[PDB]
C-alpha cells in the first residue's frame, strides 16, 4: 500500500543506558516500519521492525530534553559553514514526537519542525478510524523508570494531560 512518508529519524530503542539509533521510518496506510539505512547505495537496509497502524492510540509532540547532546541540539546557524547548511538534516534531530501503542510510547526525533508536523498530521489521518484512540497523553518523556510529567511508573499508565 502506497508510501505516505519516508524519513531518516533518531529513535530511542527499547532497553541499561537509553540507546538512540539513526533509522529510516516508512509510513504506509497499514504499517509503520523502520530499517537500518543503506547510505552508500541510497536504499532501505535491513528491516528492524514494524507495528500495525491500527494498534496506535495517540501521536503527539514530546517536551524536548532540557540538556540534549549535540546530535539533538538545534543548530545555531552559520556555526557549521557560511551558507547552504543542509547536512544538519541527517546529523541533528532536536524535534521529538511520540507514537503510543499497547507497549507504551515510541520516541522518534525529527531533524526539522516541518517534517515532525507532517508525520504527526499524516499519522493522525491514518489512525482516525482506530478503535482504541486515547484522549489523554504524557507531554514529557518517560526516563529512569518514570514519566517526567506525572512521575507514574507504568509505561502504559493513563496520560496525565487531556488532548485538545
Ligand atoms: O528498539 C526498538 C525501536 C522500535 C520502534 C518501533 O516502532 C516501529 F516499528 F518503528 F513502528 C517498535 C519497536 C521498536 N523497538
Ligand atoms: Mg557536521
Ligand atoms: Zn504523565
Curated annotation (Swiss-Prot):
Keywords of the record: Acetylation, Adaptive immunity, Apoptosis, ATP-binding, Cell membrane, Cytoplasm, Disease variant, Dwarfism, Immunity, Innate immunity, Kinase, Lipid-binding, Membrane, Metal-binding, Nucleotide-binding, Nucleus, Phosphoprotein, SH2 domain, SH3 domain, Transcription, Transcription regulation, Transferase, Tyrosine-protein kinase, Zinc, Zinc-finger
Binding site for Zn(2+): 138, 149-150, 160
Effect noted on mutating residue 23 to H: In XLA; moderate
Start and end residues of each stretch annotated as Inositol-(1,3,4,5)-tetrakisphosphate 1-binding: 11-19
Modified residues annotated as Phosphotyrosine in this record: 35
Clinical disorder: X-linked agammaglobulinemia: Humoral immunodeficiency disease which results in developmental defects in the maturation pathway of B-cells. Affected boys have normal levels of pre-B-cells in their bone marrow but virtually no circulating mature B-lymphocytes. This results in a lack of immunoglobulins of all classes and leads to recurrent bacterial infections like otitis, conjunctivitis, dermatitis, sinusitis in the first few years of life, or even some patients present overwhelming sepsis or meningitis, resulting in death in a few hours.
Designated name of the protein: Tyrosine-protein kinase BTK
Residues of the full protein shown: 2 to 169 of 659
